[PDB]
Design a protein around this ligand. Structure first.
Ligand SMILES: [K+]
Length: 243
């Protein structure tokens, strides 16, 4: 009985990437799940403001100021599930809902792709339910009645895992379905690709790391492969080409 309406998807971006990254996401996966997706940035934008309205959150800035903004906005929302992704992630909402239905409904859950205390790599995307997120507030807000000395020199993703494992006694539940670009993405082809919850694109150890799809867009038209993935998943989309 969990539905898509129970999920708050937060995307982190910055002004310098509005044209280069954000427009691509708005054309592709954000167009299939706009009602649940909120874009956190640091300057206004006429084009994004047009397409998103209040779904464009312009911040004027323990956790970084944008991540604190995402947590605060999620809690205000009241929704059961929080999922964080970066501006170089692709989200499959159908695969996401199927995974989230798999957890017992009254247990704390933190799910993602593990990295070394264990933490979910932020560039792969990760999800937390409301009950666990509400328990994180004292640390996540940098409040004056908990110890955050350890929190101040950790990145956002690490900080999240530390709070959950080290302060709350919880545990990361690993899933093979979340993917960063710190991963050899070429093992994921047309056959595996539809079962995945997130994909990524980017440079790591000197290699442009992308999923393996022959088309329907060329690498020159679609270097991230996100347009091609989108067309595999949603072939009814009018702007999808043949190849
Ligand atoms: K921190």
């Amino acid at each position: 009985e969990l539905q898509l309406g129970d999920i708050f998807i937060a995307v982190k971006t910055t002004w310098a990437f509005h044209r280069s990254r954000l427009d691509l996401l708005l054309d592709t996966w954000v167009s299939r799940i706009r009602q649940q997706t909120f874009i956190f940035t640091d300057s206004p934008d006429e084009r994004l403001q047009e397409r998103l309205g209040p779904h464009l959150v312009v911040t004027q800035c323990a956790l970084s100021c944008k991540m604190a903004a995402e947590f605060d906005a999620f809690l205000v929302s009241g929704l059961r599930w929080f999922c964080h992704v970066d501006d170089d992630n692709y989200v499959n909402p159908k695969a996401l809902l199927q995974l989230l239905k798999t957890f017992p409904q009254d247990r704390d859950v933190y799910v993602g792709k593990p990295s070394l205390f264990w933490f979910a790599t932020g560039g792969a995307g990760f999800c937390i339910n409301r009950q666990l997120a509400l328990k994180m507030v004292p640390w996540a807000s940098g409040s004056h009645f908990v110890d955050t000395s350890a929190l101040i020199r950790l990145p956002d993703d690490c900080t999240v895992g530390y709070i959950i494992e080290c302060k709350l006694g919880g545990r990361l539940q690993p899933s093979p379905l979340f993917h960063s670009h710190l991963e050899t993405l070429q093992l994921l082809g047309a056959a595996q690709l539809p079962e995945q919850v997130t994909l990524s694109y980017g440079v790591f150890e000197g290699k442009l790391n992308v999923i393996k799809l022959p088309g329907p867009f060329s690498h020159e038209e679609d270097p991230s492969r996100f347009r091609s993935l989108h067309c595999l998943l949603y072939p009814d989309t009018p702007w999808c080409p043949l190849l």
